Amino acid sequence: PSEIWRQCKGERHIRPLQGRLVRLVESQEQVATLQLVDTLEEQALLEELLESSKPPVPADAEPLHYLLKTPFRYPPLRWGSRFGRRHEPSLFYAALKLETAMAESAYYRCVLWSGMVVPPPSGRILSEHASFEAGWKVERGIRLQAPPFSDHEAALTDIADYRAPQELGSAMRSAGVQAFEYRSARCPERGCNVALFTPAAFTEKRPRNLTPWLCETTAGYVAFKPAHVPGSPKIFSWELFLVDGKLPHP
Amino acid sequence: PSEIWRQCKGERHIRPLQGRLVRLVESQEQVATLQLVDTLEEQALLEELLESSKPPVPADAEPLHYLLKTPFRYPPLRWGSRFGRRHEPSLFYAALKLETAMAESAYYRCVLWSGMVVPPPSGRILSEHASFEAGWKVERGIRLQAPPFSDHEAALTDIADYRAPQELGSAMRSAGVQAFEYRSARCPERGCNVALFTPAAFTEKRPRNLTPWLCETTAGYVAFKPAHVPGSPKIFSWELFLVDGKLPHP
Amino acid sequence: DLNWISSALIKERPSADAVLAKAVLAAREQLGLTQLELAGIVGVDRSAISRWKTQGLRVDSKTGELALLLVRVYRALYALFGGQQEDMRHFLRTPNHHLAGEPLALMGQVQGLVHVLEYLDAIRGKV
Amino acid sequence: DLNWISSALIKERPSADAVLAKAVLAAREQLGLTQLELAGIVGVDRSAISRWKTQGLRVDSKTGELALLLVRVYRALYALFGGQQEDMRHFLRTPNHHLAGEPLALMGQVQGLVHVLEYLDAIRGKV
Amino acid sequence: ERPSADAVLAKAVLAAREQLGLTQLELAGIVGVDRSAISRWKTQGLRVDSKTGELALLLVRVYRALYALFGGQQEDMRHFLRTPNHHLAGEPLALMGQVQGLVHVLEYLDAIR
Amino acid sequence: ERPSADAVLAKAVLAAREQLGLTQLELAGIVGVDRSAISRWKTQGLRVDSKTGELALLLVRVYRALYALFGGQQEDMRHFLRTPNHHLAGEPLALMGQVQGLVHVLEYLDAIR
């Protein structure tokens, strides 16, 4: 059981919760397979073949849009997500604001970079991403940044220890929690995130404000810039995430 | 002067009109300049330098979104657009339905291909595009698809000469018409387009439903496919626009 | 009116086995894999690879499923690394802290191939 | 506070003249232009071209505009041809029906450079 | 006759198929071979160095995880495989029909241990 | 003392500057030289096969289109240059300070003459 859920008396604080979410995702997946074939018709058939080998979509997420249903089908990293483990259904993770979504995305760019014993050659990766927004509403929600649970915010926002939040996630899952907000562990402005246990949290049928982004990942920073309109880059140094010269991960 | 505008006496048919528009545009412009420099910070400065050499935006289009103001700043092709000539302010051309916007876009893909006396060596151009929607509402509108103006539809939708529609465009512009609809000359479904003389035609200041598209242009067809979700290509054969052999242009 | 002009005689219906064979050989070349390295991932001999170009790779087979997973590895790597070929190849042939070792060596076995693919899927935004 | 100091330690304030000089030389490379073809488009000699790496290219000068127009030509060609370099090179070195002739030959003169650029801007669905 | 790796793996996967109540067609779809080739494992063996051998080994590990989790109740192991699971995306036996689902079922069983 | 191609182009630019009432700085920004080079055109000339000569020829063609459009009436040629225009994106003389604007003003005047 979760000590944080036994304390705080979590069941007493379950209440309806609403809001919007922002999520930054990669594009170029379809561009990738278009390089393997000759025609768009061959690429469409290949994408159908690739779909058949993927983990199945949970039955309740199938009628959703592709960008809303996909997070529910794949397992997380082997060390689990912050509030979910490899053996439980994956959660839909997003941020409440765009700048928090970029911080979480920049951190996992550093995670990919730091996994390789030898850093990527040329010391720069130019990739393309897309952000979208969506409304969510649940009748059984929890605010982990709220006074009852914020007494454990140090253990909930730990940079390289998932045990306490992962046990809290299983305890909320069994208690019927449908979605919950929490303090981001990576956002330097202390923005809040939101996680959805069930695809029924989504109010709308289609993701909104789809925006392409250009991403630049180096050994020292991750930068984001709109791909379709004039803008200035938003820079995320590795110093936002490094602890003792090393990138933390569980 | 336009005598088709005189036979119809269109000044009496200027009436308020609302509606939606959909428009297919290119992306990868910002990706292009990112290949020339080393950082996103340098790319943002380069894009500012390139802006200073562009034709200035009309003052009323300045507060609009980048995707809404840009068509008003560049001159058309030197043989003019269908309702506008090289020496006149540019018009905002869009379609009423997405299928018509793809047909118009597929035609100008063939126009670019046909300009080269020898086709490109790759035999196939893979480009990235984006579609967006916008609401438009004008107090002074005209419907060239209406029976009063539909009696000249053979001259307004002619495939290879702009003389009659261009004179009609200058007549509507001088008569105070802010926007007008007309029959598309390229859409196989006989969809309707819409043209805006003024940026004040837009209800909102932002585009809606930005959607990325994969485009495949060959010597035989043009195919479009969503770049972010699973889908089947919408193919437009060159034969939809070729007349007696080769593509016509005025 | 003339919607039939493009509704037919411009749309082709390609074979699934031929598309899979074409895609897995192109993914082999882009990732810089040898024929024997590809043979060890999907579990065939180099002679059977030479039949894919004339016969195709049957999708209903376990050989085809492993080829689908391999293409998804290329597909995720391309999106993660922006299509930069030298970085995608570097990832496969460099020891990795998060995975059990060098990803290309891991993909030589079934459980390692799934391990590499699941990592690349989960580290993507869209998870 | 953490974001403020982190951005301040890595913030880059690039030079306009140095950025333009780097951009036009990179555009010259990708478009396959010789040192003399570039010199005839922007209107300098080859000594001033190599001198750009030490000084940059003065943006507020008339040479800067021609270089800015040249970058915009590469920019529109990239977007129209999906970054396929040899198709972009093909367009510039192939006689064109809609233009007065070979675009690269037209771009050797200021009136032809504007004509090539205005054509590429107008044929973009961006307009 | 001398013991061999191929005979050892064949005996193990055939013993797992027996206890789990899997038919030849169900086993054929999990290890990716035809129903006729299953009958040849007894006389000859199953190649350990093959992809079919790697998947057969994964299936044995699934049976070993089911045996340890249900204490050897053969009837409970068969009920787990053919009943839609609340925590999983579908029926475990159906998930094991694909490569990634076969690994996922093993990952799920090892964690609940 | 006897004609050259650079000398005739010079006078055409100098005469167009006097006729249109352009300042030495406005002329310098259109053809892309410094103000010291303006005075050196009368003692030598303007190189026809140069970017400055190309821009100078286009500016001189603009004075031509203005002369034919206004019938030689000098004040309306000057008034057209310094008055904000509907069909142009701004003031014509301000547009002529840039390369694409100089071509744009010439194309507009050529179509309406």
Numbering used by the authors:
A (entry chain C), B (entry chain F): 1 to 250
C (entry chain A), D (entry chain D): -4 to 122
E (entry chain B), F (entry chain E): 7 to 119
Mind quoting what the paper says about this structure?
We show that NatT is an NAD phosphorylase, which leads to the depletion of both NAD and NADP in a subpopulation of cells. NatT function is tightly controlled by NatR, which is both an anti-toxin and an auxiliary factor required for toxin stability. NatT belongs to a subgroup of RES domain proteins that have adopted a Flap region mediating its interaction with the anti-toxin NatR.
NatR–NatT adopts a hexameric structure with two central NatT molecules flanked by two dimers of NatR (NatR’ and NatR”). NatT is composed of a peripheral ring of α-helices and two central β-sheets that form a cavity. Although NatT is structurally similar to other RES domain proteins it harbors an additional helix–loop–helix domain (hereafter referred to as ‘Flap’), which provides most of the interaction surface between NatT and NatR’ (C and EV3B–D). The Flap contains several conserved negative charges (E26, D38, E42, and E47), which form electrostatic interactions with positive residues in helices α1, α4, and α7 of NatR’. Residues R82, Y108, Y162, and R186 coordinate a second phosphate molecule in the active site of NatT, positioned next to the nicotinamide group of NAD+, that likely participates directly in the cleavage of NAD+. In the NatR–NatT complex, the C-terminal helix α7 of NatR’ extends all the way into the substrate-binding cavity of NatT, indicating that NatR’ controls toxin activity by blocking substrate access and that dynamic repositioning of α7 and NatR’ is likely required to activate NatT.
